[PDB]
Amino acid sequence: VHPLTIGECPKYVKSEKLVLATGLRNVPIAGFIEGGWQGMV
Amino acid sequence: FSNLERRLENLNKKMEDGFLDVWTYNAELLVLMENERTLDFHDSNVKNLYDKVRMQLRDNVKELGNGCFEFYHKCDDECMNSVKNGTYDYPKYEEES
Amino acid sequence: DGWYGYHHSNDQGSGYAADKESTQKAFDGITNKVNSVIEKMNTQFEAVGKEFSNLERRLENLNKKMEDGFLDVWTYNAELLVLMENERTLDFHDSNVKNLYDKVRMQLRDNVKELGNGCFEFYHKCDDECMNSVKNGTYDYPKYEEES
Amino acid sequence: DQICIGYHANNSTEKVDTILERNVTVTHAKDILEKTH
Ligand SMILES: *[C@@H]1O[C@H](CO)[C@@H](O)[C@H](O)[C@H]1NC(C)=O
Numbered sequence A: 001v002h003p004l005t006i007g008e009c010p011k012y013v014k015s016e017k018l019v020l021a022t023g024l025r026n027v028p029i030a031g032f033i034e035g036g037w038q039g040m041v
Numbered sequence B: 001f002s003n004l005e006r007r008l009e010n011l012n013k014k015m016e017d018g019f020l021d022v023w024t025y026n027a028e029l030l031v032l033m034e035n036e037r038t039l040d041f042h043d044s045n046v047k048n049l050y051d052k053v054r055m056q057l058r059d060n061v062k063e064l065g066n067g068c069f070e071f072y073h074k075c076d077d078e079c080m081n082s083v084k085n086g087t088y089d090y091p092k093y094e095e096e097s
Numbered sequence C: 001d002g003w004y005g006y007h008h009s010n011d012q013g014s015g016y017a018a019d020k021e022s023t024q025k026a027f028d029g030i031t032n033k034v035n036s037v038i039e040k041m042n043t044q045f046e047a048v049g050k051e052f053s054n055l056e057r058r059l060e061n062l063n064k065k066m067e068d069g070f071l072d073v074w075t076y077n078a079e080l081l082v083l084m085e086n087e088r089t090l091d092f093h094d095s096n097v098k099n100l101y102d103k104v105r106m107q108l109r110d111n112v113k114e115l116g117n118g119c120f121e122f123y124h125k126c127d128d129e130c131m132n133s134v135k136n137g138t139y140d141y142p143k144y145e146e147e148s
Numbered sequence D: 001d002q003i004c005i006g007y008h009a010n011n012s013t014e015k016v017d018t019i020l021e022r023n024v025t026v027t028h029a030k031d032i033l034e035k036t037h
């Protein structure tokens, strides 16, 4: 948001996005070699 | 800073810009390196089930080549429960031919 | 022809060919990897040098320390980023050639012998059209069978 | 008769970058950068 911040704050960075994957590659009778079990929730 | 402290103001600015570049660079690579590993982690885990299961089923199934196994001996829901857990009883089942 | 691939021998001849799908994906990966290392570095106009009087020794020392400090940080990071990335590049390549080995083993299934040296031997005669199929994801398992 | 081993997929459009890949769609993701005030 801004580098001149007063308080107990997160580190300021010049990046636009920092996104961690937590999940699987989303690749939507056949097993994983195909990929895509949308029916398994 | 006063107008006669330009070198000190510049020292302060450089110190702050320096730390910002360090933290930005580290944030960018930590995210990319961690994401590379997260996706490999997940691929490894699904493959590990495939072999965990293949190794208990041994010779009583066909590998179909598409991430599945076909049983030679009839396998019902109680068998399914066993295979889906670490309890498949190899000795009770056999190949037909 | 490429980084990963096939070698074959059959009634019609022998030779080498790259697995273009596998090589191109690995290639693009390495290219993106190199670019991540280089493109994420921030380049700005800088002059670096400062002048101090003889009555500003603590300020000159503060400036020197700040500059030496950042240099040690960037040098250390450069050294480990290169070593960590090289460890992964080499594991990446080993993984990719093994992945072809199993990608192929799983389509050939029971119609081949595993020879234990990174090759397969066919029970049924397999010609250049078969070779093309195996070298792609199109091997037709049902059309071939074990002799004994 | 048949048992398969596989994995989850959904309708998510969250994307991440990795060292080797760019714009990889994932089933779940977490944004760790605060953008608003
Ligand atoms: C995606 O799937 C979830 C869970 O079934 C559903 O609630 C949501 O409406 C779907 N569509 C979109 C655009 O999120």
Ligand SMILES: *[C@@H]1O[C@H](CO)[C@@H](O)[C@H](O)[C@H]1NC(C)=O
Binding pocket: D022, D023
């Ligand atoms: C990733 O997606 C963004 C947003 O659409 C786009 O600007 C960028 O060029 C894409 N990068 C690649 C490598 O596809």
